[PDB]
């Protein structure tokens, strides 16, 4: 919890609410996929993967 609410200060909290800009996509997460297209080759990850 790295929120300024835990400082228990009204001044710093009001300054945070005024200066904070909206970030719509910040409230969403995503998956970390690992693609493995078997094409009969060896080596590192293909540009396709």
């Amino acid at each position: 919890s790295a929120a300024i609410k835990d400082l228990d200060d009204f001044g710093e909290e009001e300054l945070f609410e005024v200066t904070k800009e909206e970030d719509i996509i910040a409230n969403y997460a995503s998956v970390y996929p690992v693609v493995e297209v078997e094409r009969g080759r060896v080596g590192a990850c293909t540009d396709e993967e």
């Binding site: 200060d9 009204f10 001044g11 909290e13 009001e14 300054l15 005024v18």
Partner: protein
């Protein structure tokens, strides 16, 4: 982007009914043009942040029209903005020796909000009506426009009042404020108010520091003080009448007998005196009867030592305490708040917004009706209040320490507490405390003896063969030496 775009060019409108003026500020119609009042300012010499300004005019029916005028800071510092948040976090302005930390930018505190003379300035006026006994007949609160005629200092105001070749309307108004302040202070001391002393000194700069100067008091210092007290009392009653759940007030708890326990044991078994604890008036009257015939300063010493035994004043909102808990022990008033300093203190900023809601000037912000937010605000400004006091006492104590090593001399002082291996000496010349360890006090600390009941420490002084007994409340003489490879000794 919160400050006014005009900057230094911001001016108060000459016609409050101007259509262009009211189009930008619709609340201008609810403002009382008081620029015909001969208002003056009394602040320390070389002051750029003027919060208060007084005026006095004799009504035709024998009474006086006394009115204090406070900077209309809440006209520029609006809630919900970064300017309000920056001032709420700072809580107050810290006043060190060399530097000074402001709560608000200098555009407001020095130019636009400060009640500068010869310029039209917005203000929050509190108009009274006093008789020949300094009794309030009726009080009225209003936002106004003023133009200060003069901006005297304390020394300049004391001269013009005592001057005999000036008898204009403004000068005669300053005569009435002096005769009304002594009558307000008279009934306050009879109500049980205290009279404590504070070692408040200020050093001068060009190196940089050279010497320390004790600040003398003037009759004008009490002139402004009694009306600043009267202004806060009237506003406290007003803002509590309108918002009894979230009124920004200040209280002072009664001191427990535990605080004055050790102090009375010292005065009884060394000076044969005591301090009454029945009521606040009994405590104040006992300090007046607590004086030494040989040391006129000893009376002020007891008043200083009893100040450390006093409870700490507290900011609070009215919804968290019953009305009998609003009592202020030190001022002996039923209810009190801070209002006459919105440039310095943030508590006064909340008082201005609440006072503007009682008059109907503008609706009170919802944040000042929230018990949760008001409780947090009160804790913060309380913490920032003590920190601002501890910062000033430490800056005066450090910058006077540079005067100890860079200016060797001998100064007289009084001891305030004795230990088994050290003495604490208070010096009125500098208003600071000094610890003298036993190792730096004698050549043989093993042959010393400490008597806890009589508060004395017997030791063989350095460069001396006769033992000296040092009791508490002794008028000793200390020196200053530089042993580094700053220090105070005992002459």
């Amino acid at each position: 982007e919160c400050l006014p775009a005009e900057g230094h060019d911001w001016k108060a409108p000459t016609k409050l009914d101007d259509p262009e003026a009211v189009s930008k500020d619709p609340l201008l119609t609810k403002r009382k043009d008081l620029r015909d009042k001969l208002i003056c300012s009394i602040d320390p010499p070389g002051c750029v942040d003027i919060n208060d300004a007084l005026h006095a005019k004799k009504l035709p029916n024998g009474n006086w029209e006394v009115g204090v005028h406070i900077a209309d800071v809440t006209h520029f510092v609006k809630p919900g903005t970064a300017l309000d948040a920056e001032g709420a976090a700072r809580g107050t302005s810290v006043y060190l020796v060399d530097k000074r930390i402001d709560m608000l930018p200098m555009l407001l505190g020095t130019d636009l909000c400060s009640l500068k003379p010869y310029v039209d300035r917005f203000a929050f006026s509190v108009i009274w009506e006093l008789d020949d006994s300094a009794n309030i007949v009726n009080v009225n609160f209003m936002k106004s426009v003023i133009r200060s005629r003069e901006a005297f200092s304390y020394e300049q105001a004391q001269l013009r009042i005592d001057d005999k070749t000036q008898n204009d309307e403004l000068t005669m108004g300053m005569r009435a404020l002096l005769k009304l302040s002594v009558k307000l202070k008279q009934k306050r001391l009879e109500a049980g108010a205290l009279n404590l002393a504070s070692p408040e000194v200020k050093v001068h700069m060009d190196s940089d520091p050279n010497e320390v100067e004790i600040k003398k008091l003037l009759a004008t210092n009490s002139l402004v003080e009694e009306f600043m007290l009267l202004a806060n009392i009237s506003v406290a009653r007003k803002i509590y009448d309108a918002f009894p759940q979230t009124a920004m007030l200040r209280r002072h708890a009664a001191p427990p007998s535990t605080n004055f326990e050790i102090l009375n044991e010292m005065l009884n078994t060394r000076k044969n005196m005591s301090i009454s604890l029945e009521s606040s008036k009994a405590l104040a009257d006992s300090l007046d009867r607590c004086v030494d015939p040989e040391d006129p300063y000893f009376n002020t010493l007891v008043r200083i030592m009893s100040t450390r035994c006093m409870m700490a004043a507290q900011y609070f909102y009215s919804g968290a305490y019953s009305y009998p808990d609003f009592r202020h022990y030190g001022l002996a008033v039923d209810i009190y708040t801070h209002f006459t300093s919105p440039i310095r203190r943030y508590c006064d900023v909340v008082a201005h917004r609440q006072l503007a809601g009682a008059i109907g000037y503008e609706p009170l912000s919802l944040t000042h009706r929230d018990k949760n937010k008001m409780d947090m605000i009160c804790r913060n400004i309380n913490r920032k209040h003590r920190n601002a006091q501890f910062a000033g006492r430490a800056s005066i104590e450090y910058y006077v320490g540079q005067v100890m090593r860079n200016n060797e001399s001998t100064e007289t002082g009084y001891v305030i507490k004795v230990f088994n291996n050290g003495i604490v000496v208070l010096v009125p010349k500098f208003g600071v405390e000094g610890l003298i360890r036993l190792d730096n006090l004698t050549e043989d600390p093993n042959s010393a003896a400490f008597d806890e009941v009589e508060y004395k420490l017997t030791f063989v002084p350095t460069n001396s063969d006769k033992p000296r007994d040092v009791y508490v409340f002794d008028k000793v003489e200390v020196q200053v030496r530089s042993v580094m490879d700053a220090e105070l000794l005992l002459k």
